[PDB]
Structure 1
Amino acid sequence: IVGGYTCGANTVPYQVSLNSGYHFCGGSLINSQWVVSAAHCYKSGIQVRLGEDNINVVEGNEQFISASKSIVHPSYNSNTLNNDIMLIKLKSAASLNSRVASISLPTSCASAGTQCLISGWGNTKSSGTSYPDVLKCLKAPILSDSSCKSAYPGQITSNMFCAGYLEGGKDSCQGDSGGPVVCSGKLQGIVSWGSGCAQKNKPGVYTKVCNYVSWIKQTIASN
């Protein structure tokens, strides 16, 4: 996250880290046994880490649970990043409390102008590299589809939205990928891609979770 603030320990209780020997992507806890992330984060041998603040120090609220199964969206296109979403099932159910909680899936799509919280452990610099140990947060509005498609001509589909600031300075970034965009208490997006980070006229682009609800519910009911 560039231009954000330190969320504070376990203030974002649905935030996950995906670990394969190291943090590589975020994710969101959607019930005791299921995580939603970005299909571009797919790897074999994932360990899910819940209850994290400092990802380098054991501070007492963690639960580290390996993944049983990963399901990448049937239509995911790695060249376009269209349908950039995947489901991870945990080998055992997480123990849910105040500091480790699921986030609700949406009933409606959220509109342009809605304010959202985006969080992750990703790069905090627009130029150069500097990875935080503690969780960082950003509040950012959803942009109009017009503005989004004018920023990324030919690249935005129905399954994406923009969020952030056209003036740059404030964005998500590499390492935040797969993580949550929560608006009005519901999971609306997943951190997917962008041109650089926090650059002027190049906002972040997010998977539009309200288009996948039926696919998520069906999947989890049968697996």
Structure 2
Amino acid sequence: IVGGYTCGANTVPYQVSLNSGYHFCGGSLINSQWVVSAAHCYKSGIQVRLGEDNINVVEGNEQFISASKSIVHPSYNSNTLNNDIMLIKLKSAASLNSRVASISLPTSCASAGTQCLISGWGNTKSSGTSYPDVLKCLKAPILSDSSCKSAYPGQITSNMFCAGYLEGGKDSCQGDSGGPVVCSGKLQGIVSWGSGCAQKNKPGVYTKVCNYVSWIKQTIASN
């Protein structure tokens, strides 16, 4: 997260860290045994870390659970990042409390101007890499489809939306991918891509979760 602030330990109880010997993507806890993340974060050998704040130090509240399976959307296209979503089933269920809790899925899509909270342990520099030890937060608004389309012509599908600041300086970045975009207490987006990080007129692009609610429920129900 570039231009954000320190969230405060465990203030984002549904945030998870995907680890393969180092932190590589974020994710969101939607039930005690399932996490939602981005399809391009897929790999084998994933350990899900819940209740984290400082990813380099065990401080208490953490729960490390191996992933039993990962389900990448069947229509995911690695060239356009259309349908950039994945579900991960945990080997055992997490113990939910005030420090580890799930987030709710939306019942309707959100509109432009809605203000959301984006968090993660991704790069904090738009120019060079500096990855933090603690969880960073950023409040950003959903932009209009015309502003998004104008910014990335021919690259935005109906399963994506832009959020951020066209003036640059604030945005999600590499390492934040697969993490949550929460608006009014509902999971509306998944950090997916962008052209660089926090550049002017190049806002972040997020997977539009409201378009996958039925898929998510159907898939969890059959696995």
Structure-2-length-normalised TM-score: 1.00
Distance in 2, Cα, partners of 1:159 & 1:200? 23
Query: How far apart are residue 156 of structure 1 and its match?
Result: 0.1
| CA offset digits 1:155-198 (Å, max 9, x no partner) | 00000000000000000000000000000000000000000000
Deviations 1:45-98 (A, max 9, x none): 100000000000001000000000100001000000000000000000000000
Partners of 1:112 and 1:199 lie apart in 2 by 20
Unaligned runs of 5+ in 2: none
Distance (Å, rounded) in 1 between the aligned partners of 2:90 and 2:176: 21
Q: Which residue of 2 aligns with 1:81?
A: 81
SS at match of 1:35: strand
Task: State how far apart, in whole Å, the 2-side matches of 1:35 and 1:139 are.
Answer: 22
Deviation of the 1:121 alpha carbon: 0.1
SS state at 2:88 partner? strand
- Say which SS state the counterpart of residue 11 (structure 1) adopts: coil
Q: For 1:111 and 1:64, how far apart are their aligned partners in 2?
A: 36
SS of the residue 2:219 aligns to: helix
Query: Counterparts of 1:20 and 1:149 in 2: how far apart (Å)?
Result: 35
Q: Following TM superposition, by how much is the alpha carbon of 1:111 offset from its aligned partner in structure 2, in angstroms? A: 0.5
CA displacement 1:84-128 (0-9 Å, x = unmatched): 000000000000000000000000001000000000000000111
- Cα deviation for residue 130 of structure 1 reads 0.3
**RMSD, matched Cα:** 0.3
Structure 1: unaligned runs, 5 residues or longer:
none
How far residue 16 of structure 1 moved from its aligned partner, in angstroms, is 0.2
In 2: Cα distance, 1:29 partner to 1:191 partner: 14
User: How far 1:135 sits from its partner (Å)?
Assistant: 0.1
TM-score by length of 1: 1.00
Structure 1 runs of 4+ with >3 Å offset: none
Measure the CA separation in 2 of the matches of 1:59 and 1:105.
Answer: 30
Residue 6 (structure 1) shift: 0.2
CA distance in 1 between counterparts of 2:116 and 2:94 reads: 26
Instruction: Give the fraction of aligned pairs with identical amino acids, expressed as a percent.
Output: 100
